[PDB]
Structure 1
């Protein structure tokens, strides 16, 4: 159909995982995975991931939420915005056997190049300005209130803020089942 009316914008670190981005970005595992650009290279780190502190993992309820929302594709789209590395995010999704083929990731840049996930306000504005994007339901989740407000401001700037649910919880405290119900009740065509 070529139309995207409903978008779920998710921070990664501390929102999908249990650990705030500050204590993860410089961790050995994150730095090692940063340059692993294929599934084969990333999967070598699965054993270390599974042995890691539970807090760095994608949470059980966030995994279930991503898989549930994936079933609503293409009527709902998932966008992950993050100043972490694209290969770290893809690695963790793959370690959890989460299909991310349809998830859009706006991540950190490489080296001195600035990536779209480093400016969450600009990332939301740019995504909303894509030709296929239409007004509709917006879900925004972020464990960092400042970061989450920047995504909210991107919606306001583009006139896309009239039906927004913004959730700012601490890591591990997000009510993903509640937000899935928010999606179903506010996306009528997605009811099918």
Structure 2
């Protein structure tokens, strides 16, 4: 059973840079085909020397690590037009465990992936048999795409308790959102304490 889900855009939400200025960048293109930990980790040096705007933000890192400790009472879903291997590389560079994070990303080549249609990605996830009504958090730096994810919840009758946050990159209030999870998810907080 999964009752509480956190849906996060990646570029500009977990990182400091809008997707459009990152998707075509040499580093993102290079990492797109790096399908193993060993192949991705060769890029850590280039990542650490990059403009700070493209990195996972300090506060988003701390949020992800903190919410990871609430598994399995809370699950994290990343929905993104970016490449799966770029997302996994950056999580690995910041020493963020992604083994229980679900990633819906770009497709490969001419195949379309689930992260390319955010509305449909949310509907598909909610229709998985293990997913149940409960707490929903949605964060997106693109207000239109955020509303699309909200619309997915509405469409599935999963919009009973939704916190939706849309901020400019670098302005997300991650500590407050953690408090929102704790104040709205009783079994999460009981686990996180004792």
Partner residue in 2 for 1:62 = 60
Q: 1:106-151 CA distances to partner (integer Å, 9 max, x unpaired)?
A: 0000000000000000000000000000000000000000110100
Q: Which runs of 5+ in 1 are unaligned?
A: none
The one-character-per-residue Cα deviations of 1:70-90 (angstroms, maximum 9, x if unpaired) are: 000000000000000000000
Flag structure 2 segments of 5+ consecutive residues without an equivalent. none
How far residue 162 of structure 1 moved from its aligned partner, in angstroms, is 1.0
* Post-superposition CA distance 1:53-104 (Å, at most 9, x none): 0000000000000000000000000000000000000000000000000000
Decide which structure has greater helix share. Answer: 2
Distance 1:12 1:89 in 2: 8
- Structure 2 Cα separation of the partners of residues 181 and 77 of structure 1: 16
| Helix, strand or coil at the partner of 1:179 | helix
Q: Deviations over 1:159-190 (max 9, x none)?
A: 00010000000000000000000000000111
Supply the distance in 2 between the matched residues of 1:190 and 1:135 (Cα, whole angstroms).
15
- Find the residue that maps to 1:190 and give its secondary structure: helix
CA distance in 2, matches of 1:73, 1:53: 32
Query: CA–CA distance in 2 between the matches of 1:136 and 1:46?
Result: 38
> What SS does the corresponding residue of 2:189 show, helix, strand or coil?
coil
TM-score (norm 2): 0.98
Task: Say what the alpha-carbon RMSD is for the aligned residues.
Answer: 0.3
* CA distance in 2: counterparts of 1:6 and 1:51, whole angstroms: 36
- TM-score, length-scaled by structure 1: 0.99
Q: Name the CA distance, whole Å, in 2 between partners of 1:22 and 1:30.
A: 11
Structure 1 Cα separation of the partners of residues 184 and 37 of structure 2: 35
Partners of 2:120 and 2:185 in 1: CA distance:
25
- Which residue of 45, 49, 52 maps to 1:51? 49
Report the Cα distance in structure 2 between the residues aligned to 1:162 and 1:135, rounded to whole angstroms: 8
In the alignment of these two chains, the number of paired residues is 190
Q: Distance in 1 between matches of 2:5 and 2:155?
A: 16
Cα offset, 1:191, TM superposition: 1.3
Cα distance between partner residues in 2 of 1:187 and 1:144 = 26
